[PDB]
Design a protein around this ligand. Structure first.
Ligand SMILES: CCCCOc1ccc(OCCCN2CCOCC2)cc1
Ligand SMILES: CCCCOc1ccc(OCCCN2CCOCC2)cc1
Ligand SMILES: [Cl-]
Ligand SMILES: [Cl-]
Lengths: 148, 148
């Protein structure tokens, strides 16, 4: 992955997000509810020290993890988290990768709605990536624990 | 679905195909190996009477079904099968739909290779359809029973 958000203000991504779409390098990273990269983002909480606290749902448990910051403002560690793109107000695109290469990305949105602009920009960003599974969820599913 | 292949010669789609990509209206139609629309096409055999015999794999059993012809050359019955597009020699795009509306489509290719033109044309055809899961398989997986 070589698309990172230039000049990211991590402070301004704080608050509520919806995992609208997810894609991944291997089907088995996203196919089941229990699949390893099937994580639904609930809230992003940037620390004052510039680390990133993530609230997510995983099959339906609430979970807290911290993405520690790096020399690069758009990259964090946990497995690396890269912020591709965001307008802070509506959408955020990010990716997760390990070091084998297993890779998963998400289109996050602020509200439980189908943002077609945000999905275009998501599909554009995936054209360069070797994804073999893509999921997308409706407004109903977005308002349920673990998108059931 | 309102993209059908004009002037389809069903005779000329006979022989060997590979289920390279699959998309579907609902995740649960494609997520597991046992998912209802997770069918891998092996061979297409058009009858002289103009019906279509389908050999497929389903989780790993071989299976035979006949798609009976209709007044429209690009539409068959089993649940309806619509042939969107094909160049006979390389790719075929089709869709399956019931009457609720549960809908699944496939990019078939002649050989076990990743045809980027055929996937473009597949993605173009899905832009108009309400798909929530898409899968794609590598050359290795294409040469295995049920794409394991
Ligand atoms: C731009 C910031 C968005 C980053 O959001 C996430 C980054 C990494 C994630 O990783 C999930 C890792 C899975 N954990 C271990 C297994 O149980 C669930 C938590 C999840 C969200
Ligand atoms: C252009 C012709 C391609 C059509 O290929 C297929 C059409 C319909 C299919 O339907 C699968 C229905 C599932 N059957 C019942 C459940 O067990 C497996 C067979 C499969 C391939
Ligand atoms: Cl939708
Ligand atoms: Cl591939």
């Amino acid at each position: 992955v070589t698309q990172t958000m230039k000049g990211l203000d991590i402070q301004k991504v704080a608050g509520t997000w919806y995992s609208l779409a997810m894609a991944a390098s291997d089907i088995s990273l996203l196919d089941a509810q229990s699949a390893p990269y099937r994580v639904y983002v609930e809230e992003l909480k940037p620390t004052p020290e510039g680390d990133l606290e993530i609230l997510l749902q995983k099959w339906c448990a609430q979970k807290k993890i911290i993405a520690e910051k790096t020399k690069i403002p758009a990259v964090f560690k946990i497995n690396k988290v890269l912020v591709l793109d965001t307008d802070y107000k509506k959408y955020l695109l990010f990716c997760m990768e390990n070091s084998a290469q297993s890779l998963a990305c998400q289109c996050l949105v602020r509200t439980p709605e189908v943002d077609d602009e945000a999905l275009e920009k998501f599909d554009k960003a995936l054209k360069a990536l070797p994804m073999h599974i893509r999921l997308s969820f409706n407004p109903t599913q977005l308002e349920e624990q673990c998108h059931i």
